[PDB]
Amino acid sequence: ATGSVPLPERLLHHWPNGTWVENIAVRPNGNLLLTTSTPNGTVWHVKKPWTDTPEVELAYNFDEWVDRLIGIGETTPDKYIVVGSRFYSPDAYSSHVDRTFAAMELDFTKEPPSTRMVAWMPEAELLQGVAALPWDRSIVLISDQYVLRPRYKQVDWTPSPGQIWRLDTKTGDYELVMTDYAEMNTTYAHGPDVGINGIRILGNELYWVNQDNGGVYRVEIQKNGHPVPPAVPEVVSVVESQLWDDFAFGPGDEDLLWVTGLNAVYAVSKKNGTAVVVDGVGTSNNMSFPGPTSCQFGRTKHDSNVLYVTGNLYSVPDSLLDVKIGGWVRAIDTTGFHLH
Amino acid sequence: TGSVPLPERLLHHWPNGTWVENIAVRPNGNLLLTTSTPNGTVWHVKKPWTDTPEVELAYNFDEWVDRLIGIGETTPDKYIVVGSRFYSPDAYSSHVDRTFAAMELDFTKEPPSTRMVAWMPEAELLQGVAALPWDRSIVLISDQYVLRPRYKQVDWTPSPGQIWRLDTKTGDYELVMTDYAEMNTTYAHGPDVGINGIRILGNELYWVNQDNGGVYRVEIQKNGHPVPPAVPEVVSVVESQLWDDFAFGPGDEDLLWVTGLNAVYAVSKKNGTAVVVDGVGTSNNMSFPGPTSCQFGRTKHDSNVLYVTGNLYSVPDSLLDVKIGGWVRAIDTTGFHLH
Ligand SMILES: *[C@@H]1O[C@H](CO)[C@@H](O[C@@H]2O[C@H](CO)[C@@H](O[C@@H]3O[C@H](CO[C@H]4O[C@H](CO)[C@@H](O)[C@H](O)[C@@H]4O)[C@@H](O)[C@H](O)[C@@H]3O)[C@H](O)[C@H]2NC(C)=O)[C@H](O)[C@H]1NC(C)=O
Numbered sequence: 001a002t003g004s005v006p007l008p009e010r011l012l013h014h015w016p017n018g019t020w021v022e023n024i025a026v027r028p029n030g031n032l033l034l035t036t037s038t039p040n041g042t043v044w045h046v047k048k049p050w051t052d053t054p055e056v057e058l059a060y061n062f063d064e065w066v067d068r069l070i071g072i073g074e075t076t077p078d079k080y081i082v083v084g085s086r087f088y089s090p091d092a093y094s095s096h097v098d099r100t101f102a103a104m105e106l107d108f109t110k111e112p113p114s115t116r117m118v119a120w121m122p123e124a125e126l127l128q129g130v131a132a133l134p135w136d137r138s139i140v141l142i143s144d145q146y147v148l149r150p151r152y153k154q155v156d157w158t159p160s161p162g163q164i165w166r167l168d169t170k171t172g173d174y175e176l177v178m179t180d181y182a183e184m185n186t187t188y189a190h191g192p193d194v195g196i197n198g199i200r201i202l203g204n205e206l207y208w209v210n211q212d213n214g215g216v217y218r219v220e221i222q223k224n225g226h227p228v229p230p231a232v233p234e235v236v237s238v239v240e241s242q243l244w245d246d247f248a249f250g251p252g253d254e255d256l257l258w259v260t261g262l263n264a265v266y267a268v269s270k271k272n273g274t275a276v277v278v279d280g281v282g283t284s285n286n287m288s289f290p291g292p293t294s295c296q297f298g299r300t301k302h303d304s305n306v307l308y309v310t311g312n313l314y315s316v317p318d319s320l321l322d323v324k325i326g327g328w329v330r331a332i333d334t335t336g337f338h339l340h
Numbered sequence: 341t342g343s344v345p346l347p348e349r350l351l352h353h354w355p356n357g358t359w360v361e362n363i364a365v366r367p368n369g370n371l372l373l374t375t376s377t378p379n380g381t382v383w384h385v386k387k388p389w390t391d392t393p394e395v396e397l398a399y400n401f402d403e404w405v406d407r408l409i410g411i412g413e414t415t416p417d418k419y420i421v422v423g424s425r426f427y428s429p430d431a432y433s434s435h436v437d438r439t440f441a442a443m444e445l446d447f448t449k450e451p452p453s454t455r456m457v458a459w460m461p462e463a464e465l466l467q468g469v470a471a472l473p474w475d476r477s478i479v480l481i482s483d484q485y486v487l488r489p490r491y492k493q494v495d496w497t498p499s500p501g502q503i504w505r506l507d508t509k510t511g512d513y514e515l516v517m518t519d520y521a522e523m524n525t526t527y528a529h530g531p532d533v534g535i536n537g538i539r540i541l542g543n544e545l546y547w548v549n550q551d552n553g554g555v556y557r558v559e560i561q562k563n564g565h566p567v568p569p570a571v572p573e574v575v576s577v578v579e580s581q582l583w584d585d586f587a588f589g590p591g592d593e594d595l596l597w598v599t600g601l602n603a604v605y606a607v608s609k610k611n612g613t614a615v616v617v618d619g620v621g622t623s624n625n626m627s628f629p630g631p632t633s634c635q636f637g638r639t640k641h642d643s644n645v646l647y648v649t650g651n652l653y654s655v656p657d658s659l660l661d662v663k664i665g666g667w668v669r670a671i672d673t674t675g676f677h678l679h
């Protein structure tokens with residue numbers, strides 16, 4: 001063995017070719033809410049994900065406001081902020097359309113669930129991850145980085161600075177809390193990609209991962225969501241080969257982060273940054289995690305130690321330059337795991 | 341002399357894929373042309389009265405827009421251009437919703453300067469620009485196209501045709517006219533716009549509607565809103581014509597000159613009588629493939645000359661003939677009479 005690598009894994013559900021599953025939130029009742037980036041910007045609802053073949057249904061298509069959805073984060077219980085924009089095409093390598101990013105709310109405290117525009121954010125480059133402040137959950141932080149001049153045919157790859165916005169979902173007011181940080185930046189060390197990708201908050205520690213340098217970072221944040229001076233990022237862990245996407249603390253209060261990387265998932269010590277691949281490439285179970293994108297732990301007695309992993313690729317490619325989109329959601333049972 | 345078809349000549353032809361969309365004539369008489377594709381640019385035609393005049397890229401507006409549509413002069417030799425991001429440079433591509441903007445090209449400086457005047461995300465598709473003659477730092481801007489533009493247009497639900505007032509000094513803007521059948525399209529002429537070009541003469545705002553062949557006008561107050569009850573006056577109707585944009589004149593003459601379906605028309609302001617002067621409908625019927633706008637020369641060499649922009653390679657015989665390939669031409673109107 002219990003806890004041996006590769007950890008036990010199963011497939012919950014697989015979407016058709018062209019469906020890009022990008023992020024995940026777990027509801028208080030334990031069901032999953034998944035964002036998709038293509039073919040449409042939607043949220044899908046996975047019911048009783050601890051069962052063998054859970055039912056899944058479209059919860060809402062956000063076409064009214066966006067072509068694509070990216071990140072999702074819960075605010076007050078069973079309300080969720082999602083982010084997205086218009087995109088030049090549903091193709092996997094398409095850029096966004098500049099100035100079309102927005103934050104929208106999906107309110108599952110009403111049935112049917114209610115949606116609304118929370119904030120157009122034309123000044124952001126590309127909104128990515130969403131993390132509510134634990135003590136003030138109506139306030140969210142949002143990560144932001146991609147090409148500075150997105151166009152129909154991308155030629156100028158000048159990256160925008162990685163940065164993090166504060167959004168007050170009650171008023172729609174937003175402001176930058178952090179920008180101009182090498183730790184949020186990309187230099188395309190890993191090819192065309194982003195710098196800062198997922199963000200998650202635990203207590204008063206804001207964590208993020210960098211897709212281009214394999215760094216995991218954190219910084220202490222004040223009650224208003226701005227960093228505590230001198231606002232210098234603390235390195236948690238560096239695995240230079242890994243194209244980190246998003247992550248989850250836990251389970252429960254284990255001293256660990258669980259992070260999606262390059263066709264694999266890793267456990268990472270919060271104390272000292274020791275990193276161990278637990279499934280996918282680098283283990284004998286090396287075809288089962290093609291292009292994972294995010295992960296979050298279950299929230300019921302059935303699955304508190306189960307890490308639910310989204311992914312967007314049909315098979316493991318020989319090349320990151322010609323992937324094939326076909327999304328999925330899987331489950332990794334972390335019970336008994338130990339770094340060594 | 342003055343006979344139809346009026347004398348015409350080509351000043352310059354652009355490569356295939358180049359869509360020349362509108363025109364402003366500078367105080368010194370040179371032409372400033374907007375392009376929609378391949379890029380959003382202004383081209384500068386020097387001494388257009390000469391036989392084969394020189395032309396050059398004045399500014400590429402890529403920093404803010406994939407495409408430019410209309411252009412209108414504000415204070416002397418400053419110009420507002422409008423444009424947005426588009427899903428592709430394909431001739432049939434929709435715009436990307438909420439990316440429209442008005443920018444300024446300042447030709448008083450050397451080299452010409454540019455700035456962003458207003459992002460206008462509430463607008464649907466900005467089209468024609470016309471400054472107020474008594475307050476040229478205020479411009480009216482027409483606006484109509486699909487209500488829900490997308491990567492592959494399937495819902496053709498049209499936006500209401502309307503007109504914005506933009507204060508170029510503050511960047512503030514508000515609607516002054518909306519909810520008018522006369523600015524609307526029902527696609528009587530196929531996928532198109534409703535209100536297209538706008539121009540202002542004195543305190544009279546004119547516009548053409550591309551879908552119903554109508555020419556209209558309303559009186560406007562000094563603050564730029566129409567005089568109540570702001571009912572459009574029908575000026576002329578030619579049902580078959582896909583009007584795009586137009587020019588008053590030349591000089592004192594009681595006429596508008598309007599680009600139509602592969603043709604140009606002179607139109608009486610007093611009574612709306614409409615005479616095709618070049619293109620389809622005259623014996624010289626291939627020389628105006630898809631004209632887009634027109635304005636008169638402003639020098640002693642060409643104040644009776646109507647410079648006409650266009651975006652089509654040739655008059656399309658069938659709907660899959662349409663080849664984008666733009667141009668600028670000149671129609672000498674000297675001696676013309678309605679007859
Ligand atoms: C000029 O063209 C406009 C664009 O087509 C015309 O506007 C449309 O007019 C129709 C007929 O009245 C309206 O249809 C009704 O809409 C209501 C609901 O309206 C509200 O919700 C819609 C949907 O979000 C929204 O678009 C409206 O602004 C309202 O907030 C329905 O309950 C009726 O059953 C009926 O369908 C259209 O709603 C309206 N569209 C827009 C975008 O305004 C306009 O009538 C034309 N004017 C003239 C003089 O011909």
Ligand SMILES: *[C@@H]1O[C@H](CO)[C@@H](O[C@@H]2O[C@H](CO)[C@@H](O[C@@H]3O[C@H](CO)[C@@H](O)[C@H](O)[C@@H]3O)[C@H](O)[C@H]2NC(C)=O)[C@H](O)[C@H]1NC(C)=O
Pocket residue numbers: 254255256268269270271272273274337338339340
């Ligand atoms: C780097 O940090 C990790 C944690 O992120 C450290 O691993 C943890 O080490 C502790 C020992 O201090 C382990 O606790 C022991 O667990 C066993 C098994 O249940 C229990 O019987 C013992 O009484 C004790 O509690 C803990 O399991 C382990 N955590 C994980 C996730 O592996 C690691 O030691 C640190 N490395 C260095 C070099 O300090």
Ligand SMILES: *[C@@H]1O[C@H](CO)[C@@H](O[C@@H]2O[C@H](CO)[C@@H](O[C@@H]3O[C@H](CO)[C@@H](O)[C@H](O)[C@@H]3O)[C@H](O)[C@H]2NC(C)=O)[C@H](O)[C@H]1NC(C)=O
Pocket residue numbers: 593594595607608609610611612613676677678679
């Ligand atoms: C419809 O309206 C148009 C004007 O938009 C009329 O054409 C204009 O008719 C006037 C007659 O009052 C012409 O002006 C007169 O002719 C000459 C001008 O050199 C002069 O001898 C007179 O003193 C007076 O100015 C004007 O030239 C003419 N405009 C054009 C462009 O032809 C037209 O008669 C009206 N009706 C129809 C059926 O067209």
Ligand SMILES: *[C@@H]1O[C@H](CO)[C@@H](O[C@@H]2O[C@H](CO)[C@@H](O)[C@H](O)[C@H]2NC(C)=O)[C@H](O)[C@H]1NC(C)=O
Pocket residue numbers: 017314315324326
């Ligand atoms: C979904 O996409 C996958 C991957 O592109 C398709 O699998 C390929 O199918 C072709 C045959 O058309 C084979 O030549 C390739 O070797 C397959 N690739 C892999 C990795 O197996 C799959 O057929 C598509 N599914 C559907 C229903 O269209």
Ligand SMILES: *[C@@H]1O[C@H](CO)[C@@H](O[C@@H]2O[C@H](CO)[C@@H](O)[C@H](O)[C@H]2NC(C)=O)[C@H](O)[C@H]1NC(C)=O
Pocket residue numbers: 148159160161162180181182183185
């Ligand atoms: C993070 O990335 C941004 C964007 O690449 C960097 O900002 C650029 O810095 C160079 C040199 O200092 C300037 O020439 C560019 O004009 C800047 N671009 C923008 C968009 O501001 C920034 O220096 C990086 N920060 C760190 C700490 O590495």
Ligand SMILES: *[C@@H]1O[C@H](CO)[C@@H](O)[C@H](O)[C@H]1NC(C)=O
Pocket residue numbers: 039040061063
């Ligand atoms: C995606 O959204 C569009 C518009 O809302 C719709 O036509 C289509 O059926 C949706 N689903 C797809 C493409 O799977």
Ligand SMILES: *[C@@H]1O[C@H](CO)[C@@H](O)[C@H](O)[C@H]1NC(C)=O
Pocket residue numbers: 356653663665
């Ligand atoms: C421009 O388009 C026309 C229309 O199809 C075509 O005949 C012509 O060859 C093109 N010009 C080129 C390819 O240089």
Ligand SMILES: *[C@@H]1O[C@H](CO)[C@@H](O)[C@H](O)[C@H]1NC(C)=O
Pocket residue numbers: 378379400402
């Ligand atoms: C369009 O503009 C870009 C610069 O923004 C330039 O690289 C490209 O060559 C232009 N296209 C054409 C056809 O000139």
Ligand SMILES: *[C@@H]1O[C@H](CO)[C@@H](O)[C@H](O)[C@H]1NC(C)=O
Pocket residue numbers: 620621623625626655
């Ligand atoms: C132009 O005129 C000629 C001569 O009558 C005719 O054959 C041709 O069809 C006309 N073309 C158009 C586009 O009207």
Ligand SMILES: [Ca+2]
Pocket residue numbers: 022128129197198245246293
């Ligand atoms: Ca991501």
Ligand SMILES: [Ca+2]
Pocket residue numbers: 361467536537584585632
């Ligand atoms: Ca036009």
